[PDB]
Amino acid sequence: PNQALLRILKETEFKKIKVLGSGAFGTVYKGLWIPEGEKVKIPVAIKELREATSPKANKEILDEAYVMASVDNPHVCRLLGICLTSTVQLIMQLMPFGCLLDYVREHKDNIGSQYLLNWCVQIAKGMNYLEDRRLVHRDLAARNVLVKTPQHVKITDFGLAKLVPIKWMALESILHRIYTHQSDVWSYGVTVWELMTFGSKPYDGIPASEISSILEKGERLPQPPICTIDVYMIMRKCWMIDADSRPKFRELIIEFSKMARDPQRYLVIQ
Ligand SMILES: *CCC(=O)N1CCC(Oc2cc3c(Nc4ccc(Cl)c(Cl)c4F)ncnc3cc2OC)CC1
Numbered sequence: 001p002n003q004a005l006l007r008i009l010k011e012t013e014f015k016k017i018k019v020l021g022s023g024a025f026g027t028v029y030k031g032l033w034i035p036e037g038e039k040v041k042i043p044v045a046i047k048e049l050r051e052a053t054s055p056k057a058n059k060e061i062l063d064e065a066y067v068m069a070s071v072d073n074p075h076v077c078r079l080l081g082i083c084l085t086s087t088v089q090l091i092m093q094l095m096p097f098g099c100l101l102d103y104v105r106e107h108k109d110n111i112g113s114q115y116l117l118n119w120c121v122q123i124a125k126g127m128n129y130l131e132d133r134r135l136v137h138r139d140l141a142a143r144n145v146l147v148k149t150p151q152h153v154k155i156t157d158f159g160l161a162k163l164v165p166i167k168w169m170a171l172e173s174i175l176h177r178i179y180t181h182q183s184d185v186w187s188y189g190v191t192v193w194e195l196m197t198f199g200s201k202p203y204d205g206i207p208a209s210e211i212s213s214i215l216e217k218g219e220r221l222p223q224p225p226i227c228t229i230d231v232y233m234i235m236r237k238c239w240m241i242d243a244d245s246r247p248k249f250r251e252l253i254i255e256f257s258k259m260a261r262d263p264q265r266y267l268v269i270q
Pocket residue numbers: 020021022028029045046047079090091092093094095096097098099100101102143144146156157160
């Protein structure tokens with residue numbers, strides 16, 4: 001473990017400025033990092049996890065935090081600092097444009113095929129890096145991809161589950177609680193479907209308990225109108241029951257990179 005990669009922050013070093021979101025996990029804020037002895041105010045995001053009733057020990061938390069601090073890839077968010085008190089507070093660079101799911105929903109009219117394909121490439125690059133580190137994300141979804149700038153996105157919330165999204169999970173994860181890189185590939189396929197539909201809800205209106213029976217019967221998310229069969233076939237391959245028959249993230253990089261070269265060929269957008 002490279003301890004230098006992770007800053008242990010003092011409560012005086014950072015300030016919460018505004019609420020960005022809240023959920024069962026806790027609260028996420030926009031704030032400022034003001035390291036002592038420096039002349040800079042750094043915009044950051046601060047995530048405060050809900051106070052644990054039987055928390056993991058501080059040693060265990062730091063061990064996971066070191067892993068999150070060691071991620072070095074342009075398409076995966078890195079843990080910048082941590083503050084451990086009654087709660088766990090995580091500090092990361094601010095991604096000013098928010099989650100990609102909100103972004104595609106707000107910009108449905110103005111999003112072209114090259115943007116969409118470039119995002120697919122960047123997401124697969126991030127996931128491939130995590131696989132290279134032998135790390136399983138387990139919660140990839142459009143809501144967990146953040147927009148640093150419109151053409152630079154990063155996968156977030158890695159390791160947060162350690163420290164249930166049935167509609168993004170591979171069948172084996174639902175039935176047997178098995179999570180692997182190939183189950184991440186299934187989630188990747190759903191994430192791409194979210195983007196191609198400009199933020200539609202997958203299996204809209206269907207209860208979580210019914211999803212597995214839908215998947216067992218061979219039903220899958222429908223082909224988005226803008227996707228050519230070439231793009232849809234890739235998405236469908238991510239949803240095969242046999243996990244090893246799904247594409248590899250390394251393969252997804254190559255395919256979407258090729259399509260990104262001729263976007264109008266692979267996406268038909270008004
Ligand atoms: C859009 C889906 C949704 O409702 N939300 C996701 C984005 C949230 O707004 C922003 C969050 C961040 C984060 N989040 C974050 C994730 C992991 C970790 Cl460890 C940490 Cl410390 C985080 F802060 N990170 C960076 N920038 C942003 C920016 C956001 O909006 C500008 C709201 C809920």
